[PDB]
């Protein structure tokens, strides 16, 4: 009957997990679409219609839909216990019926300013022209560390006679990790985001040492300034990091409840 | 929020019927048992009445 | 899943959704009848300040 | 075994498949009112990302 | 590649009537026998008390 | 402004009837159910009358 | 086929066709209206160029 009982209480409290992360990935849901269409006014916004007034137009819109991300993270609450705003941590919620039979739950900080949503940038310091083309030297490696903890060298053999937009689009397509655009005065930059790059990026090669780059600006959601074209091609790719990272939250908690779905049935027999 | 807010406090608040039915079922059948048996139970004393008186 | 009379969570969800079908229908219509994709700012803010000085 | 009152685990069992079929019924009512396999994590957590990224 | 990407995700994301009714409908079926086998699983302590009562 | 002004009145004055017929639903059921179990509440003075009287 | 409702890529292959049609249809009539095919570089650069000249 002491079981019996324990096995009650279990139920119960996993029910209440179920509840807990159904309450956090329901505000995600929102948390999702607020940045896809930031995306969707960062994709306006680099393009070379629209005039400086209208580029302010998407920033007052952004900067109110990056207000409402700071908004969602810290309002969010289930009982008065903020769940998105990162104060919750780790809590361990038990499902047994015996003491120490508990399984662990944690919700990272969704502020548009967490490091996880976004990266470093590294911007040329040399623009190059609408008549800039390749020479002889193209050859552009990147060496830095995933999160992983092992070392990736990803090297580049940039095409001869290519612009410099080309050559952007060409570093996107060659790999995944490190994002490729160009700005204003046609300075090519690099955004290596915090989830899939840890440490500084070393960029060397003929074509890096000729573009030239500078020390990384680490960047974030909030961070984003789609009033310039470079902000609006660096935004593409900060709420790409961001949608990332809210992304594998989502499939965390996912898991995690259907954990509990098996493990309520399983205390049933 | 207020839909998963809502199902959370139906989770623990709120009663369940098919159980809550099936536990006062229980409830009425032990209503008719406990009557059956003290109706019983208080003939003792009679028979032993009848023993010597 | 106990069986539920005072929460009805399955219609919450029914009716969150016939709200968002219904809003959908409305701006639909809205476009339709002034042949206007951007008749407010709520659309395309962008959009609206482009076409206006256009 | 033997007849008993304080026990129903006959009707457990009968109301253990209730939650079963009110779950697997909660489900499919929500998949038809917004008319989406995928509203959660819960039913396609590898489903979810790739949706999301198309 | 707009069209065929959406069509991809329908694939995966959309929800198929043609098999949900019929999931649902399942659903509803199964509590209905789930009740049906309840309300007569219950009248086992009225067997009991039908017996020495 | 009238137009707005409407669609803001409905948002404050008219009723959902989404919401409202839901509402009489869960207010007939719970009903059904007290009137239910106020009819099986009487009886138990009734097995006060069949215990020894 | 699964057939769903908020996907309808039959209907996105309609109207696809159709703006390439309507496409087709205003060079036409741009071309009969003005009475040269080339009325801009979009239509031949290498005309435009020879018949500027010429």
């Known amino acids: 009957t002491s079981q019996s009982r324990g096995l009650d209480m279990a139920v119960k409290n996993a029910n209440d997990g179920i509840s807990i992360a159904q309450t956090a990935e329901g505000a995600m849901n929102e948390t999702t679409n607020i940045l896809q269409r930031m995306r969707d006014l960062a994709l306006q916004s680099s393009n070379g219609s629209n005039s400086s007034s209208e580029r302010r137009a998407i920033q007052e819109e952004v900067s109110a839909l990056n207000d409402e991300l700071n908004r969602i993270a810290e309002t969010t609450s289930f009982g008065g216990n903020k769940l998105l705003n990162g104060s919750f941590g780790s809590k361990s919620f038990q499902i047994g019926a015996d003491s120490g039979e508990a399984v662990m739950l944690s919700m990272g900080s969704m502020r548009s300013d967490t490091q996880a949503m976004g990266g470093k940038s590294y911007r040329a310091q040399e623009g190059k022209a609408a008549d800039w083309r390749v020479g002889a030297a193209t050859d552009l490696t990147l060496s830095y560390t995933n999160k992983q903890g092992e070392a990736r060298e990803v090297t580049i053999n940039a095409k001869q006679g290519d612009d410099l937009e080309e050559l952007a689009t060409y570093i996107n397509g060659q790999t995944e990790d490190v994002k490729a655009s160009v700005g204003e005065d046609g300075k090519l930059q690099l955004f290596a985001s915090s989830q899939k790059v840890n440490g500084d990026v070393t960029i060397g090669g003929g074509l890096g040492g000729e573009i030239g780059f500078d020390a990384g600006r680490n960047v974030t959601v909030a961070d984003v300034n789609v009033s310039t074209v470079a902000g609006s091609q660096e935004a593409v790719s900060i709420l790409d990091g961001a949608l990332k990272a809210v992304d594998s939250q989502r499939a965390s908690l996912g898991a995690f409840q259907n954990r509990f779905g098996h493990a309520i049935s399983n205390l049933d027999n | ?53 | 899943m106990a069986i539920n009379v005072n929460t009805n969570v399955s219609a919450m969800t029914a009716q969150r959704y016939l709200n968002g079908a219904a809003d959908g229908m409305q701006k639909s219509m809205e476009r339709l009848s002034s042949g206007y994709k951007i008749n407010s700012a709520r659309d395309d803010a962008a959009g609206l300040q482009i076409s206006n000085r256009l």
């Open chain 2, 1 to 53: 929020v207020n839909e998963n807010v809502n199902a959370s406090r139906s989770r623990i608040r709120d009663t369940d019927y098919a159980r809550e039915t099936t536990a006062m079922t229980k409830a009425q059948i032990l209503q008719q048992a406990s009557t059956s048996v003290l109706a019983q139970a208080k003939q003792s004393p009679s028979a032993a009445l009848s023993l010597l008186g």
